[PDB]
Design a binder for this molecule. Structure first.
Ligand SMILES: CC[n+]1c(-c2ccccc2)c2cc(N)ccc2c2ccc(N)cc21
Ligand SMILES: CC[n+]1c(-c2ccccc2)c2cc(N)ccc2c2ccc(N)cc21
Ligand SMILES: [Ca+2]
Ligand SMILES: [Ca+2]
Ligand SMILES: [Ca+2]
Ligand SMILES: [Ca+2]
Lengths: 90, 90
């Protein structure tokens, strides 16, 4: 597969590596989202060390209000992070 | 870097491999978008062989109406493709 398809595959895989840890295996709860950011986005986002930051990130990306981040909400988060990186440089 | 960061990097790179071919080097015109889909998404999207399909895809993703796909519009397209794949399986 192409580099773009490898990226799509990796996005799906990372989501599940974190969503499938606890509770609803199809969504990210706060602790899963914190670990995803801290382990997988260390070059793009500041490490999260405070509950208030976890809470604010989840609040910002939880579009449907159910308290967790589903796959569509995760992809919107990825788009936001990627666009912010691009805008930093361009 | 992590697998997620490699994916972010690949998304930026593929965009530029296609946007930087012709005209505005920061946006995808129709021909650049067609080649991106045909060369890089052959496992996820049907090959485009008709002008009418090119036109419809651009119309659908060109949120700001300027006739080209910028980086933010491309990331929305990636999110849409990735979410559609996920929903096919889940
Ligand atoms: C069955 C869907 N699906 C896919 C999946 C497979 C193929 C394409 C898209 C997603 C998946 C893909 C990866 N990498 C990691 C975990 C899961 C997963 C985990 C749980 C579940 N209940 C469904 C899951
Ligand atoms: C200067 C921005 N920037 C980046 C870039 C570099 C680092 C981070 C994000 C984007 C870039 C990254 C890749 N892979 C391929 C092409 C370009 C590119 C091409 C043209 C341009 N005028 C700016 C460009
Ligand atoms: Ca979970
Ligand atoms: Ca939600
Ligand atoms: Ca161009
Ligand atoms: Ca546009």
């Amino acid at each position: 597969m192409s580099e773009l398809e490898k990226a799509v595959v990796a996005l799906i895989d990372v989501f599940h590596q974190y969503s499938g840890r606890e509770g609803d295996k199809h969504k990210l709860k706060k602790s899963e989202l914190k670990e995803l950011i801290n382990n997988e986005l260390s070059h793009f986002l500041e490490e999260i060390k405070e509950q208030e930051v976890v809470d604010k990130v989840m609040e910002t990306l939880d579009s449907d209000g159910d308290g967790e981040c589903d796959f569509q909400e995760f992809m919107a988060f990825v788009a936001m992070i990627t666009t912010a990186c691009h805008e930093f440089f361009e």
